[PDB]
């Protein structure tokens, strides 16, 4: 059976092609002994007192290869419990991944794990496939990076891809900064995890930020409470929507970048004028950071304000979009016509890593 591994900056999603969900979802972290020899994922966190913990993937790109090998090793033998030499393996990569990185992923899979076949797909393209489309523009926002990726007839259009180095972890850091200013103590990575949970449980995207600020200033109607591990109950009101507003207004964390609605529009305006109607009518949201309540309605509003007045705009935000990349990979690797598209180990032995492009 083919395997599918979606390597994210924050979470690894892995499982078997043809399944409706990844069987393994675990933190993309590797720890090694600080004094006087590796752990991956939840066990690394459990033993963080004796380990130095690193994320091998930064903003969607693999940066620590030795640790990335540990992530894949753990994926195969500990999480999925498979022998990789027995399974074709589909891997994912970020948009705009350097060619050298794609070659190195290929070399490690064939030479270190001895997979019989592999393939590398762009994450956003798989999310589009998971919605049953081969044309559209995807907003994929995870833990480390956000991209707008316009895709036509199955191919991402690389010249029109936009990137924002703002995503879920930066939103958690911003919420942590706001809550620290209010007088709570959140400092360590363990404590930041409490903030991440607050963000997921209570934050939302306001349809109209100014209006929502006025509501929260004049009423307690938006307030929600949350019990911290130490027993304190914190109440938040405008913090709920000021946190993800940073996606529309990156200046909130001191970035000069345009917001996700403007990067969507600019992406579409980089594409051929003859495909723009298809993009506007097929805006698919993918990734954990697109889960906030309200985000699709806000996107619909903002893109409507930027686009020509008669343009048909549709935002597609599937309930399963935390795992839409992986589900697209599960579909693609299960299809009969895809089976001749795997790069085989035999082809790699003849031609080397450059075959992957």
């Amino acid at each position: 059976t083919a395997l599918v591994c979606d390597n994210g900056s924050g979470l690894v999603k892995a499982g078997f092609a043809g399944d409706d969900a990844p069987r393994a979802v675990f933190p993309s972290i590797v720890g090694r002994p600080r004094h006087q020899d590796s752990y991956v994922g939840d066990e690394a966190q459990s033993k963080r007192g004796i380990l130095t913990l690193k994320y091998p993937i930064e903003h969607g790109i693999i940066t620590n290869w030795d640790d990335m090998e540990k992530i894949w090793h753990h994926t195969f033998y500990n999480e999925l419990r498979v022998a990789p030499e027995e399974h074709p393996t589909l891997l994912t990569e970020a948009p705009l991944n350097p060619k050298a990185n794609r070659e190195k992923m290929t070399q490690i899979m064939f030479e270190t794990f001895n997979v019989p076949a592999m393939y590398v797909a762009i994450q956003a393209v798989l999310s589009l496939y998971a919605s049953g489309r081969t044309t559209g523009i995807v907003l994929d926002s995870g833990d480390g990076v956000t991209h707008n990726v316009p895709i036509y007839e199955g191919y991402a259009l690389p010249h029109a891809i936009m990137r924002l180095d703002l995503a879920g972890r930066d939103l958690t850091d911003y919420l942590m900064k706001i809550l620290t200013e209010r007088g709570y103590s959140f400092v360590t990575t363990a404590e930041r995890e409490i903030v991440r949970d607050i963000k997921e449980k209570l934050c939302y995207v306001a349809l109209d930020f100014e209006n929502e600020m006025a509501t929260a200033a004049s009423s307690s109607s938006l307030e929600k409470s949350y019990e911290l591990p130490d027993g304190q109950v914190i109440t938040i009101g405008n913090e709920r929507f000021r946190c993800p507003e940073t996606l529309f207004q990156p200046s909130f964390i001191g970035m000069e970048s345009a917001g996700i609605h403007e990067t969507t529009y600019n992406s579409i305006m980089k594409c051929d004028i003859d495909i723009r109607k298809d993009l506007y009518a097929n805006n698919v949201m993918s990734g954990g950071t697109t889960m906030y309540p309200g985000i699709a309605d806000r996107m619909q509003k903002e893109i409507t304000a930027l686009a020509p007045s008669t343009m048909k705009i549709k935002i597609i935000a599937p309930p399963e979009r935390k795992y839409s990349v992986w589900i697209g990979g599960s579909i693609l690797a299960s299809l009969s016509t895809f089976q001749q598209m795997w790069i085989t180990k035999q082809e790699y032995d003849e031609a080397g890593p450059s075959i992957v492009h």
Binding site: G15, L335, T337, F338, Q340
Partner: peptide
Amino acid sequence: PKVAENLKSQLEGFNQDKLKKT
């Protein structure tokens, strides 16, 4: 070319209810 055409057709027509429950 023919492969790309058929693959697009299978993706566009795929019913996610076919996928196995985990």
